[PDB]
């Protein structure tokens, strides 16, 4: 069928977490808040993608 929509930032953060543990914290590739690059926990983004991958198939 058709793929569930995932934003580019979430795609970047997912790819940034390749070969990394779920507790590893990576910098965003796109987002800046309060004068700093937003940090993302790898466990959250992998969970965010796995949820969407199951929201279509």
């Amino acid at each position: 069928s058709s793929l569930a929509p995932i934003s580019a930032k979430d795609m970047l953060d997912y790819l940034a977490c390749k070969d990394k543990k779920p507790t590893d914290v990576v910098k965003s590739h796109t987002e800046v808040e309060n004068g700093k690059i937003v940090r993302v926990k790898c466990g959250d983004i992998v969970a965010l993608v796995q949820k969407a991958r199951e929201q279509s198939g």
Partner: protein
Amino acid sequence: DISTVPDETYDALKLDRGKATPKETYEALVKRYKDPAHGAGKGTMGDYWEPIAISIYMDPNTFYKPPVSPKEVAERKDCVECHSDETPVWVRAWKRSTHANLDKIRNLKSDDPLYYKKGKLEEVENNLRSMGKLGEKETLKEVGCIDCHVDVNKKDKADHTKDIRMPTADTCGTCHLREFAERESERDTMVWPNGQWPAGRPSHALDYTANIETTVWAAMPQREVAEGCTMCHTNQNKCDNCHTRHEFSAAESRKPEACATCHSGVDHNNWEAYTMSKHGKLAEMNRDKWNWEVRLKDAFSKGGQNAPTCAACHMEYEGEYTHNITRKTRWANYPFVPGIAENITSDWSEARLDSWVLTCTQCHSERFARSYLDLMDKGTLEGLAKYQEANAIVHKMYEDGTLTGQKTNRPNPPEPEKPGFGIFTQLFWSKGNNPASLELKVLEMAENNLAKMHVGLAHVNPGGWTYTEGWGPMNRAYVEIQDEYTKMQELSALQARVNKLE
């Protein structure tokens, strides 16, 4: 059997790979090729547009009739002799072409780098014998005017007012079955896992169909403008856009310049990105040092080529070279197309990435190749995110109904188009405040500037994704979007204060 044609092509034609003759394969090909259901004809929206004068040369299978003025009955020799005065350069170009010098091809000795052409000639003759246009031991003497423009291997008379045709892809595919079958295999190889694009697209096999299936193309009153789109979208109909008439030189089609006329501009600056990169600049510097007459298989060896070209990169697949250019496509130029970015991590995309690495590893190491292609993917997604944030702003204004003239001056697009937000039609049709400025701006952000960013990334032009194209223009678009939004908010806040006093 053709060694370079995919299995899924034969499966789609319902043919056995071991029990199919060149005649049967050609007939199966043309039956699909000339079928209106598979893309031929005027299309679904043919009741909205009519051909103009040039359209008979753009879609000859639908519109072409021979001219009425020269009431002539002619033979093979008459074609060359009369048109020596009528279209002199056409005769002169044909004269120095391979199509007219087939004896030179038979005189090619095995230590000549062009020797493969003899095998191709014998392959052509093989195909013609299978169909019944050539005797088992009769050599094809020449490919002259009467062959392409009337009928292959014709010796009898032809009516200049009845028998003259414009040579389409099937006409070329009579002799050149391999290349025509390779081209038509794009219908079967370019299948997206989640229908990101229609089946067989994007490809040279269905470029004209795509053109005539675009609503604005069919809907717009400016036929002469719309026909400019057609001139770039003719590969489905004719085979003379890379290797042109009437020389039909393969060396010409191998040069980067042959793709430039179509693969350039605001929504795909492939020519601009490539040429400006090291790969393209080296190609410009070393074009004299390379042997373009040598085929793509032997380009990096016998040809002496030390930089990649459009054809070398895009026609190569798993070591083989074919007229199919789809089997490595992942992004398909427009990164904003639904499903495309989400698909970039799939096994389908990864296998196609491996095929690209295979191409790169002919020169660069795998570590180097995979390093830059990682940069291409992420940079592309970085551009997409920038657009997606800016689109969220303008799309919110559309839903609120706050876009300039959205309820006071937004006239409906020409039939059969439906009114909507950020649609392609708004790039070739505009009336009143349809589209709004912000709507066009964010449309152009994706359609033009995001596309060019990825093209710059894909074709290794640093400035093509940073300062000049891509990030730079998208930065400006984002800023101007944000600026207008804030301006239109504080004007709405002021208008409310005036309403609060009435």
